[PDB]
Amino acid sequence: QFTDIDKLAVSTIRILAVDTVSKANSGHPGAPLGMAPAAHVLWSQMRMNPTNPDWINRDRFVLSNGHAVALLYSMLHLTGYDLSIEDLKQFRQLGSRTPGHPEFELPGVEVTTGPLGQGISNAVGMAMAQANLAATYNKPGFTLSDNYTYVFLGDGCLQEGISSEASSLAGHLKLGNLIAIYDDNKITIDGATSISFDEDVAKRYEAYGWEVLYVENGNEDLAGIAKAIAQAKLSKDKPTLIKMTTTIGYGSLHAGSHSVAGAPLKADDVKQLKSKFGFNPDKSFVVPQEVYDHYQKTILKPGVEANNKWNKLFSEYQKKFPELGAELARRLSGQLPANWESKLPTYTAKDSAVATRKLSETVLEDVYNQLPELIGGSADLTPSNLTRWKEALDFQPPSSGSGNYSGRYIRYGIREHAMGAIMNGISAFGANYKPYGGTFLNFVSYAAGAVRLSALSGHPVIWVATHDSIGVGEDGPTHQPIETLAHFRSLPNIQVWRPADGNEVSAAYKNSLESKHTPSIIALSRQNLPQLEGSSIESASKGGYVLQDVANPDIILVATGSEVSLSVEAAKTLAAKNIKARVVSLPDFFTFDKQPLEYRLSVLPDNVPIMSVEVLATTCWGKYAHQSFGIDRFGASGKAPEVFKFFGFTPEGVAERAQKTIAFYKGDKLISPLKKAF
Amino acid sequence: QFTDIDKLAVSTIRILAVDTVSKANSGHPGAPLGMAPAAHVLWSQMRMNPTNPDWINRDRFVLSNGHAVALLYSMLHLTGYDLSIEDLKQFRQLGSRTPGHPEFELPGVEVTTGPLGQGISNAVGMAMAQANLAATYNKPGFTLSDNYTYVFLGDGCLQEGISSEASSLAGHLKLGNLIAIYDDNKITIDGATSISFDEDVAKRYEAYGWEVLYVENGNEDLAGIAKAIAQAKLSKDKPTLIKMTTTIGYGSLHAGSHSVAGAPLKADDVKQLKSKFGFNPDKSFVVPQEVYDHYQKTILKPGVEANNKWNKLFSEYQKKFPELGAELARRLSGQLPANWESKLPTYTAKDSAVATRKLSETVLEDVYNQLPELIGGSADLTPSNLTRWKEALDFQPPSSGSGNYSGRYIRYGIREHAMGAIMNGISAFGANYKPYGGTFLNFVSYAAGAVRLSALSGHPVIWVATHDSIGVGEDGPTHQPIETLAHFRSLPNIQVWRPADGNEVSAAYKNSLESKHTPSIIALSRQNLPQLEGSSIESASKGGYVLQDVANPDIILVATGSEVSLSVEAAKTLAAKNIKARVVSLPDFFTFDKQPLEYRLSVLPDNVPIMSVEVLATTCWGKYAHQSFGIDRFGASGKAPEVFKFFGFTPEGVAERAQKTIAFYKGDKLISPLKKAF
Ligand SMILES: Cc1ncc(C[n+]2csc(CCOP(=O)(O)OP(=O)(O)O)c2C)c(N)n1
Ligand SMILES: Cc1ncc(C[n+]2csc(CCOP(=O)(O)OP(=O)(O)O)c2C)c(N)n1
Numbered sequence A, B: 001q002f003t004d005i006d007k008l009a010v011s012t013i014r015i016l017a018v019d020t021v022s023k024a025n026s027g028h029p030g031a032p033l034g035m036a037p038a039a040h041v042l043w044s045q046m047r048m049n050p051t052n053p054d055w056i057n058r059d060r061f062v063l064s065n066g067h068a069v070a071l072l073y074s075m076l077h078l079t080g081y082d083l084s085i086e087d088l089k090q091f092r093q094l095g096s097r098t099p100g101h102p103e104f105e106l107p108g109v110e111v112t113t114g115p116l117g118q119g120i121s122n123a124v125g126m127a128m129a130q131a132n133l134a135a136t137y138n139k140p141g142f143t144l145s146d147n148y149t150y151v152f153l154g155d156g157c158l159q160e161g162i163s164s165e166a167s168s169l170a171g172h173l174k175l176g177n178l179i180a181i182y183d184d185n186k187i188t189i190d191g192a193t194s195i196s197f198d199e200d201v202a203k204r205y206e207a208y209g210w211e212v213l214y215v216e217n218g219n220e221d222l223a224g225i226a227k228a229i230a231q232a233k234l235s236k237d238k239p240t241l242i243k244m245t246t247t248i249g250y251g252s253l254h255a256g257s258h259s260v261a262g263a264p265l266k267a268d269d270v271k272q273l274k275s276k277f278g279f280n281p282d283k284s285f286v287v288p289q290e291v292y293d294h295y296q297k298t299i300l301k302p303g304v305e306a307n308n309k310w311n312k313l314f315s316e317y318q319k320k321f322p323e324l325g326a327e328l329a330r331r332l333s334g335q336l337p338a339n340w341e342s343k344l345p346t347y348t349a350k351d352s353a354v355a356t357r358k359l360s361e362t363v364l365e366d367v368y369n370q371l372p373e374l375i376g377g378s379a380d381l382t383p384s385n386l387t388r389w390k391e392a393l394d395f396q397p398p399s400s401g402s403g404n405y406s407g408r409y410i411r412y413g414i415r416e417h418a419m420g421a422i423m424n425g426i427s428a429f430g431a432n433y434k435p436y437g438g439t440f441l442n443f444v445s446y447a448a449g450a451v452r453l454s455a456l457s458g459h460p461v462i463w464v465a466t467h468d469s470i471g472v473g474e475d476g477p478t479h480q481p482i483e484t485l486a487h488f489r490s491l492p493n494i495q496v497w498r499p500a501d502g503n504e505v506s507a508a509y510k511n512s513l514e515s516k517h518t519p520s521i522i523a524l525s526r527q528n529l530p531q532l533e534g535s536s537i538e539s540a541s542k543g544g545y546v547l548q549d550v551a552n553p554d555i556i557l558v559a560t561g562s563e564v565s566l567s568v569e570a571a572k573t574l575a576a577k578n579i580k581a582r583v584v585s586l587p588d589f590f591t592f593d594k595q596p597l598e599y600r601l602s603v604l605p606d607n608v609p610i611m612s613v614e615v616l617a618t619t620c621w622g623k624y625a626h627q628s629f630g631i632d633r634f635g636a637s638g639k640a641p642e643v644f645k646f647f648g649f650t651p652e653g654v655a656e657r658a659q660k661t662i663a664f665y666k667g668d669k670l671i672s673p674l675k676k677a678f
């Protein structure tokens, strides 16, 4: 039962959001208006602690329809989080804690949303991670993990294919604790949904194996909303979708019109809303004391006490199960096992020629038992990406008979974008989870919508991208990347590793895993590559270094991945003609650029022509090279070696180009491209 | 009535795909083995003319499951297309006409496929275009258009969200001539579909508004398959999906196993299949004269006859409706109206400041009535993109009451990936279709999969990408592009226009609309930008040009979009301190590089330091400038102006950088970035 106070609270949220959008004269007021009742109802029965937004067993909420942020901020403020009326007053202004879309960095905000379809998929991640933590640490008597994941979504999210891939997989995995509430308001930007969206949403969701509950009166039926949620919590075998009907901008003179969607209400309209809901049409940002008292009482005080009972249970747990408790305590601190990297493979020149894709498999087998937080998977390319260790158990529902929730290997299906957002969700769940997803490097491009958010928010997720170039061969240009690495090297805060051998692959994982705010992409080859003389984890961890050196080089060859070997052979052919070439290996732009300038310039100095070698686009190389040898046209079909010779990438071919670069520059003094003038 | 000859034909096809994959010792034999029966039944009743693959009223077929090419190639050769056994004998080999995945340049091959989800989405575009052409030119007594669009797909395309997107739009539009046949084989790379894809596809498609039919013995029931297709053609108001159950690799000692999915069969295995099927186990690429004759009798000759009939009826149309006949006749030849380019707007330095986003709207207004083949739209951003002319009618089913099929304005909803793919289908259709679609620049990334293929295939589609930068403002970083253009400028064959003003917007549309093999992206501004003195359609069409000139400049400033004007103001500032700046506008890298070197070199000459200016990633600028002033970090939520000032993009701020640049190179000898050594 709700009372007069719940109605006042619902009324304090609606108006506080309006006031928050109006002042910025920028924003979306509609969804927050139409969603206040459901939000009040939902947040009151959510187990959380405004005082500790990181408590691990806290019910997690996600505003997938990111533009309704105003709503979110209102709730965070009213319920006790560190967000004041002042912050609300600097909404959408440069440098405030209240940007136009929820940002992962703010306490109370679980992921960064805004881009449609991304929030709902993150939520699937947060439920897979929960299912796993629970199955891995819960013991009879100690229920350390049992939280739920709540999502708020709109028509847009449901139209973005990414939420379909995610939802399909969520139905398969039988995620009972995932409860999604849909803002069934019948409007989007272009107007009415019937104009391009008249499908049977509930029917499409039942086909995924989800349960669908209806709430016809989302505008006022508090009892029914609270009841829909309750019913949803009893079906632990099917995720639940609640189709709740509401009127966008409810309370405004233009309720139900798309005008209220993405624009502040007219001052005139803001006044009546307030008079209507019983407020003073002349005051702004007014929160009745009784509302504060109510939330302290029903949410903050209880939530705080729930966190207290939990911590001491965890104390008893650590006494009862030392090994498992110490491990969980470690993951909770965010620290990786001690000296874990000591288990990383190393090699020498006498070792065997092996494609880095294979070398990658061997790191996974060696470290998976050292890092209980490593949960991996592939998007239907497991036998190609070699992303699965041997003694692995698939993460599946107990009823599958092909695994269970304690498992750490995920079968994403042919769903690259959803994998991207789901891994973002796993990482964001907490407990030091370290997800990795595999697929072909040219198809990582299908997940750019999510890959950007891992960088923007800083979710350190790992993409194991095999088949990095025309080394793919026969599959042809539809499968050979050309522009991928250049694209990602152009996106801020993301490591794009292209290791050249066993040691460079170890450096890739060491850096990739130790990272706490920077995702990574490891581009691996299909074809066998030899072990280089000069490579090492220590050097390679710096992103770029000098593989082979010569006193007073006539030219410097900068290469990456499969091309470092070719370059080493090109140099041999060059020594033959008395030309001294220094060979620099650059496994990651990101990590290299992070080294102090004095190191970088010792690697790429003045007074020597620098030419770069890589079988892909040359558009990003100007920052380190004087002349670039690469590909700026689509690949071809045919045996891989025949294709490489076709493009000029043979030892002599590169050598010839080195010579032309030296002659072109004789007499000119050169300056390292690393030197910026401002 | 299917007879022994129909059974012989089907065997010849299975064996032919098998011989084809095996000599290549590379390829996917599974689906070709399993879909031979459907391929035979379907093509036998498809209205096509193998001698002229461009007849506009031909029935269209799209192998969405691109990996099953050997099936498409076998069909092409048997039915009388220009493709031979020697070609098939060089399948997957360098420079051959038989690449590992179907390519748009080959006759008989409707569009390029390989990446999952694209093919089924294109077929939708092709069916809309058919609906349009029919509704636009059909007259009582002259059914010029009425062809069907058949598609072959598998679990993979059904798992990729782009297909959920496209099929959701297909059902809304009631695309009745769109018949899809799903290879329901229970297997995918990782293994059994129950492992990660157990949804109720039939129930889901029914929710979209499609009709679902079933054929449970797709391995040997030529009868049911035909009945399903005929039943399909009866529902002229709903697209149909036929769930045809097959066994992967039928005939093989490993049918039903996934080891026959993407690997060639064993020599011993190929033998038992030939014997089992009545063929000789020791011979290759054998086609019984009976099959050639059969397909000549039932497919080629009747289709040729039909093309001829259509040809005669078309000259009657041209006689009856001179104006309309003249129009289609022109479109089917591929010529744009004569002198159309005279209807493009031009401005002068004295015309008010307009956003490049608004200017774009003005062009749409002006050319819409000139180009009947211009079909446009938006992905739920019509009011923000300004992509709809006033007197426009939407493309919809007549029963809607919102428009009809003859309309030219498509409402895509929030489905960016599907839109670029549907655009590819429309363009692919023919009749000089000129589709365009709008969305915020940042989310074009969500559609990267389709875009790559627009470039790869050479489809001249157009993206009206608006809100091109931090100029967007308060929406913040999840909505401001940084890497986007640098990404798309690293992809081969695609124009990335970023017009600075009125004249440059026209130059952008002229070249874009005149393009026959290169797609486009026109990055438009959210904010107002002044008309420049010195810009002009003619010059901007070259992609780059000296906007302002000075004798003996101390520095050359290169900019694009909204930074050209900022650069012009900085030059004023620099002139006051007696520093001569030449300002160059580079509206499009693609177009620029297409110009002769000596012209390019006149724009970016030796001996002068060059500095570029653009509020996006600097990574791609090294091929033109010595020093770049750009933004290599994510953006910010704030008032546009404040964001610009916060990042340093002010008149004196650029001038200050130019001065440091001049200082840094004083005395040095400088070479143009354009000059390459090899
Ligand atoms: C990926 C992506 N595509 C497009 C946009 C632009 N966009 C923002 S809101 C929206 C649609 C309205 O969505 P809905 O969830 O229906 O809205 P509500 O009624 O809840 O405001 C559009 C097109 C975006 N935010 N994300
Ligand atoms: C976008 C994209 N993702 C992934 C792949 C790799 N891929 C090729 S075949 C396939 C799996 C098989 O799909 P299905 O439609 O089940 O084919 P079948 O084996 O039944 O013929 C995948 C993952 C691809 N080609 N493109």
Ligand SMILES: [Ca+2]
Residues within 6 Å of the ligand: A154, A155, A156, A183, A185, A186, A187, A188
């Ligand atoms: Ca809505």
Ligand SMILES: [Ca+2]
Residues within 6 Å of the ligand: B154, B155, B156, B183, B185, B186, B187, B188
């Ligand atoms: Ca399959």
